[PDB]
Coordinates of C-alpha atoms and ligand atoms in Angstrom, one line a residue:
Chain A
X8 CA 92.3 105.2 65.8
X9 CA 96.1 104.5 65.7
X10 CA 97.6 106.5 68.6
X11 CA 101.2 107.3 67.7
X12 CA 103.2 109.8 69.8
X13 CA 106.8 110.9 69.4
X14 CA 108.7 111.2 72.7
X15 CA 112.2 112.3 73.6
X16 CA 113.2 108.7 73.3
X17 CA 111.3 107.7 70.2
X18 CA 108.0 107.0 68.5
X19 CA 105.4 105.0 70.5
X20 CA 102.2 103.3 69.3
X21 CA 99.2 103.1 71.6
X22 CA 95.9 101.2 71.4
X23 CA 92.3 102.5 71.5
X24 CA 90.0 101.0 74.2
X25 CA 86.2 101.1 74.4
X26 CA 84.6 101.0 77.8
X27 CA 81.6 98.8 78.8
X28 CA 79.5 101.9 79.3
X29 CA 77.5 104.1 76.9
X30 CA 78.2 107.5 78.6
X31 CA 82.0 106.9 79.0
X32 CA 84.0 107.8 75.9
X33 CA 86.8 105.5 74.7
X34 CA 90.4 105.9 75.9
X35 CA 93.9 105.5 74.5
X36 CA 96.2 103.1 76.3
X37 CA 100.0 103.0 76.1
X38 CA 101.2 99.8 77.8
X39 CA 104.7 98.8 78.7
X40 CA 106.4 102.2 78.2
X41 CA 110.0 102.2 79.4
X42 CA 110.7 105.2 81.7
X43 CA 114.2 104.0 82.8
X44 CA 117.0 101.6 81.8
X45 CA 116.8 97.9 82.9
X46 CA 118.2 97.6 86.5
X47 CA 120.2 94.5 85.6
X48 CA 123.9 93.6 85.9
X49 CA 125.9 96.4 87.5
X50 CA 122.7 98.5 87.7
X51 CA 121.2 96.1 90.3
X52 CA 121.0 97.8 93.7
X53 CA 121.8 101.1 91.9
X54 CA 119.7 104.2 91.1
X55 CA 117.7 104.1 87.8
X56 CA 119.2 105.4 84.6
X57 CA 117.3 107.0 81.7
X58 CA 115.9 104.7 79.0
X59 CA 117.7 104.1 75.7
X60 CA 116.1 105.7 72.6
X61 CA 114.7 103.8 69.6
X62 CA 114.6 104.8 65.9
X63 CA 111.5 102.9 64.8
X64 CA 107.9 102.8 66.1
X65 CA 107.7 101.0 69.4
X66 CA 104.5 99.2 70.3
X67 CA 102.7 99.9 73.5
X68 CA 99.7 97.6 73.2
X69 CA 100.4 95.2 76.1
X70 CA 101.7 95.2 79.6
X71 CA 105.4 94.6 80.1
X72 CA 106.6 92.0 82.6
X73 CA 106.2 92.8 86.3
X74 CA 109.0 93.0 88.8
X75 CA 110.2 89.8 90.5
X76 CA 107.9 88.5 93.3
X77 CA 106.4 85.4 94.9
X78 CA 102.7 85.8 95.8
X79 CA 101.6 82.2 95.4
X80 CA 101.0 82.0 99.1
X81 CA 104.7 82.4 99.6
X82 CA 104.2 83.5 103.2
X83 CA 102.8 86.9 102.3
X84 CA 101.3 89.2 105.0
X85 CA 97.5 89.4 104.8
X86 CA 97.2 92.2 107.5
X87 CA 99.0 94.6 105.2
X88 CA 97.4 93.8 101.8
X89 CA 93.9 95.0 100.7
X90 CA 91.2 92.3 101.2
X91 CA 90.3 92.4 97.5
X92 CA 93.9 91.3 96.8
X93 CA 94.3 88.5 99.3
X94 CA 90.8 87.1 98.7
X95 CA 91.4 86.7 95.0
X96 CA 95.0 85.6 94.6
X97 CA 94.2 83.3 91.6
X98 CA 93.2 86.2 89.5
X99 CA 95.9 88.4 91.0
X100 CA 98.4 85.7 90.2
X101 CA 97.6 86.0 86.5
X102 CA 98.8 89.6 86.5
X103 CA 102.2 88.8 87.9
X104 CA 102.9 85.4 86.3
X105 CA 105.2 87.0 83.7
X106 CA 108.2 88.4 85.5
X107 CA 111.6 89.9 84.7
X108 CA 114.2 92.1 86.5
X109 CA 113.7 94.4 83.5
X110 CA 110.4 95.7 84.8
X111 CA 110.6 99.5 84.9
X112 CA 107.6 100.3 82.7
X113 CA 104.6 102.5 83.1
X114 CA 101.1 102.6 81.5
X115 CA 99.3 105.7 80.2
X116 CA 95.5 106.2 79.9
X117 CA 94.4 109.2 77.8
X118 CA 90.8 110.4 77.5
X119 CA 89.3 111.0 74.0
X120 CA 87.7 114.3 74.8
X121 CA 85.1 118.8 78.0
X122 CA 84.0 122.3 79.2
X123 CA 87.3 124.0 80.0
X124 CA 90.0 123.6 77.3
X125 CA 93.8 123.1 77.5
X126 CA 96.3 120.5 78.7
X127 CA 94.6 117.9 80.9
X128 CA 95.8 117.0 84.5
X129 CA 97.9 113.9 85.1
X130 CA 97.2 111.4 88.0
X131 CA 100.0 109.0 88.7
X132 CA 98.9 105.9 90.7
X133 CA 101.4 104.3 93.0
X134 CA 100.5 100.7 93.9
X135 CA 101.8 98.9 97.0
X136 CA 100.8 96.3 99.5
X137 CA 103.9 95.4 101.5
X138 CA 106.7 96.6 99.1
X139 CA 107.3 93.0 98.1
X140 CA 104.7 92.4 95.5
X141 CA 102.1 93.9 93.1
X142 CA 102.0 95.9 89.8
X143 CA 100.3 99.0 88.4
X144 CA 98.8 96.7 85.8
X145 CA 96.2 95.6 88.3
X146 CA 94.7 99.1 88.2
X147 CA 92.9 100.0 85.0
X148 CA 92.8 103.8 84.9
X149 CA 90.5 103.8 81.8
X150 CA 87.3 104.7 83.6
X151 CA 88.9 107.3 85.9
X152 CA 90.6 108.9 82.9
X153 CA 87.5 108.9 80.7
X154 CA 85.0 110.0 83.3
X155 CA 87.1 112.7 84.9
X156 CA 88.7 113.8 81.7
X157 CA 92.2 113.4 83.2
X158 CA 95.3 111.4 82.3
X159 CA 96.0 108.4 84.5
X160 CA 99.4 106.7 84.8
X161 CA 100.2 103.4 86.6
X162 CA 103.8 102.7 87.5
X163 CA 105.9 99.6 88.1
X164 CA 108.9 99.9 90.4
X165 CA 111.5 97.5 91.8
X166 CA 110.1 95.5 94.6
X167 CA 111.4 93.8 97.8
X168 CA 115.0 92.9 97.8
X169 CA 115.8 94.2 94.4
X170 CA 114.0 97.4 95.1
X171 CA 114.9 98.1 98.8
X172 CA 117.8 96.1 100.0
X173 CA 120.2 98.2 102.1
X174 CA 123.4 97.4 104.0
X175 CA 123.1 100.5 106.1
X176 CA 126.2 102.1 104.5
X177 CA 127.4 103.2 101.1
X178 CA 127.5 99.7 99.7
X179 CA 123.8 99.7 99.2
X180 CA 121.9 102.9 100.1
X181 CA 118.5 101.3 99.4
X182 CA 115.3 103.1 98.3
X183 CA 115.8 101.9 94.7
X184 CA 112.1 101.5 94.3
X185 CA 111.4 105.1 95.4
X186 CA 114.1 106.3 93.0
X187 CA 112.3 104.4 90.2
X188 CA 109.1 106.2 91.1
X189 CA 111.0 109.5 91.1
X190 CA 112.4 108.6 87.7
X191 CA 109.0 107.7 86.4
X192 CA 107.7 111.1 87.5
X193 CA 110.7 112.7 85.8
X194 CA 109.8 110.8 82.6
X195 CA 106.2 111.9 82.9
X196 CA 107.1 115.6 83.5
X197 CA 109.3 115.5 80.4
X198 CA 107.1 113.5 78.0
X199 CA 103.5 113.7 79.2
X200 CA 103.1 117.1 77.4
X201 CA 103.4 115.1 74.1
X202 CA 100.3 113.2 75.2
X203 CA 98.3 116.4 76.1
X204 CA 99.1 116.3 79.8
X205 CA 99.9 119.2 82.1
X206 CA 103.3 118.8 83.8
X207 CA 102.3 121.7 86.1
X208 CA 99.3 119.7 87.4
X209 CA 100.6 116.3 88.3
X210 CA 98.9 114.5 91.2
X211 CA 100.3 111.4 92.8
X212 CA 98.0 109.0 94.5
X213 CA 98.1 105.5 96.0
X214 CA 96.5 103.1 98.5
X215 CA 98.1 101.1 101.3
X216 CA 101.8 100.9 101.0
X217 CA 101.2 102.9 97.9
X218 CA 99.9 105.6 100.1
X219 CA 103.0 105.3 102.2
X220 CA 105.1 105.8 99.0
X221 CA 103.1 109.0 98.2
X222 CA 103.9 110.6 101.6
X223 CA 107.6 109.5 101.5
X224 CA 107.9 111.2 98.1
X225 CA 106.5 114.5 99.6
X226 CA 109.3 114.5 102.2
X227 CA 112.0 114.1 99.5
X228 CA 113.6 117.1 97.8
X229 CA 113.8 115.0 94.7
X230 CA 110.1 115.6 94.3
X231 CA 110.4 119.4 93.9
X232 CA 108.5 120.7 90.9
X233 CA 107.9 117.1 89.8
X234 CA 104.3 117.0 91.1
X235 CA 102.0 119.5 92.8
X236 CA 99.4 117.4 94.6
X237 CA 99.2 114.1 96.5
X238 CA 96.3 111.8 97.5
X239 CA 97.1 109.2 100.2
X240 CA 94.5 106.5 100.7
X241 CA 94.9 104.3 103.8
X242 CA 98.6 104.8 103.9
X243 CA 101.2 107.1 105.7
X244 CA 104.9 107.4 106.3
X245 CA 104.4 107.2 110.1
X246 CA 103.0 103.6 110.4
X247 CA 105.1 100.8 111.8
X248 CA 105.4 99.0 108.4
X249 CA 106.1 102.1 106.3
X250 CA 109.8 102.0 106.8
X251 CA 112.5 99.4 107.3
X252 CA 114.6 100.6 110.3
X253 CA 116.9 97.6 110.4
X254 CA 117.9 97.1 106.7
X255 CA 121.4 95.8 107.5
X256 CA 120.1 93.1 109.7
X257 CA 117.8 91.6 107.0
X258 CA 120.4 92.2 104.2
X259 CA 122.8 89.9 106.0
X260 CA 120.1 87.2 106.7
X261 CA 119.5 87.1 102.9
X262 CA 123.3 87.0 102.2
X263 CA 123.6 84.1 104.7
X264 CA 120.8 82.3 102.9
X265 CA 122.5 82.6 99.5
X266 CA 126.1 82.2 100.7
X267 CA 127.1 85.9 100.3
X268 CA 127.6 86.8 104.0
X269 CA 131.1 88.2 104.0
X270 CA 132.6 90.7 106.4
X271 CA 133.0 93.5 103.8
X272 CA 129.6 95.0 103.0
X273 CA 130.9 96.0 99.6
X274 CA 132.0 92.5 98.7
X275 CA 128.6 91.2 100.0
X276 CA 126.6 93.4 97.6
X277 CA 128.8 92.4 94.7
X278 CA 128.2 88.8 95.6
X279 CA 124.4 89.4 95.5
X280 CA 124.8 91.1 92.1
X281 CA 126.1 87.8 90.7
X282 CA 123.1 85.8 92.0
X283 CA 120.0 85.1 89.8
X284 CA 117.2 87.4 90.9
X285 CA 114.9 84.4 91.5
Chain B
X5 CA 71.3 79.8 153.9
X6 CA 68.4 80.6 156.2
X7 CA 69.9 79.6 159.5
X8 CA 68.3 80.7 162.7
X9 CA 69.3 78.5 165.6
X10 CA 68.4 79.1 169.3
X11 CA 71.6 77.9 170.9
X12 CA 74.6 79.5 172.6
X13 CA 76.7 77.3 170.4
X14 CA 76.8 77.4 166.6
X15 CA 77.8 74.0 165.2
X16 CA 78.5 73.2 161.5
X17 CA 80.0 69.8 160.9
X18 CA 81.9 69.2 157.7
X19 CA 81.7 72.9 156.7
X20 CA 81.4 73.8 153.0
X21 CA 82.3 76.8 150.9
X22 CA 78.7 78.2 150.8
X23 CA 78.2 77.6 154.6
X24 CA 80.8 80.4 155.0
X25 CA 80.0 84.1 155.5
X26 CA 79.2 86.5 158.4
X27 CA 77.4 85.2 161.5
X28 CA 76.0 87.3 164.3
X29 CA 75.0 86.3 167.9
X30 CA 72.0 88.2 169.2
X31 CA 71.3 88.2 173.0
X32 CA 68.3 89.9 174.6
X33 CA 66.4 89.8 177.9
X34 CA 63.9 92.7 177.7
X35 CA 66.1 95.1 179.7
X36 CA 67.7 97.6 177.4
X37 CA 69.1 97.1 173.9
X38 CA 69.8 93.5 172.7
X39 CA 73.5 92.6 172.6
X40 CA 75.1 91.7 169.2
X41 CA 78.5 90.4 168.3
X42 CA 79.7 89.7 164.8
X43 CA 82.1 87.1 163.3
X44 CA 83.3 86.2 159.8
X45 CA 83.8 82.5 159.2
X46 CA 86.3 82.2 156.3
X47 CA 86.2 78.6 155.0
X48 CA 89.4 78.0 153.0
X49 CA 90.2 75.6 150.1
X50 CA 92.2 74.9 147.0
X51 CA 90.6 73.1 144.1
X52 CA 92.6 71.4 141.4
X53 CA 94.0 73.9 138.9
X54 CA 92.9 73.9 135.3
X55 CA 95.5 74.2 132.5
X56 CA 94.5 75.3 129.0
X57 CA 96.6 76.5 126.1
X58 CA 96.2 78.5 123.0
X59 CA 98.2 78.9 119.8
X60 CA 98.7 82.0 117.6
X61 CA 104.5 89.7 110.2
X62 CA 104.3 85.9 110.2
Ligands
NAG18 C1 72.8 73.7 172.1 O1 73.5 73.0 171.0 C2 74.4 72.0 171.5 C3 75.1 71.5 170.2 O2 74.8 72.4 169.1 C4 73.7 71.0 172.3 O3 74.7 70.0 172.7 C5 73.0 71.6 173.5 O4 72.3 70.7 174.2 C6 72.1 72.7 173.0 N1 71.5 73.4 174.2 C7 70.6 74.4 174.1 C8 70.1 74.9 175.4 O5 70.1 74.7 173.0

């Protein structure tokens, strides 16, 4: 009916969803749930910070804005993205038309029901085409959750420049997008129990660059105890496009393009932090 | 080409690519084994070159 759950950060209201299938039971959706603080201002090109609490009932009945991106045939790479994505950009475009730098939100799909009893497993989907675009909002976990009797989570992390820019030194260490994912997993571990999830059985899965993300997370000590299993579909950490080996090179090209190319890498990053994300 | 000429001299005027190949002169008289000698005629040439071009992440 009216799905309300109290988390460590406040009360959240969900929304019931019926599936177009008579055997599948309905599900509860929590859309636009903040799992970290907005990466704006001095928090741009910086690790994620925990989200701020709220005292009232926060609504989670609609997707939050997606992270900044330009997929309107803005010279995207077709060889890396899934064919279903590139062959249907008009529909895909509708999912990312509403953008904001404040985009660190996740979505939760909870089944309304089987056999063995106890806390249900949590499956966290990590999307990714080329690290520059996309959103977890494109993947409805309703059926997977309802059919398998598991909790499904989709995550939105900082993309492209905002999520991975690195100067090759301490000015900008990069991997902000990965840190958001780690932070999202942290939030899940700490709050999914309130939704009936098992933090001891968290599985991360993703396809394409999303699959690359999954493997990279398994090589980081930051993932210890966070999750227990991983599923990597058509994506690894060993492919040519999984990692950026010349971040500094591209960081300066961007800076030159926006008038921020100074000798000092620290001043360069501060200059970028003053620029509009667009 | 099917080219059997009874002549101690082989003559091909205005030779062509195809007229090239290996020729053998056979000589017999009844006494013993016929005499054979081989030679490779290697007609040479250089036609006009053809130049084509093709266009072609991101
Ligand atoms: C042999 O051929 C040459 C030219 O090919 C000709 O002048 C000559 O008369 C011929 N003689 C005989 C015996 O075949």
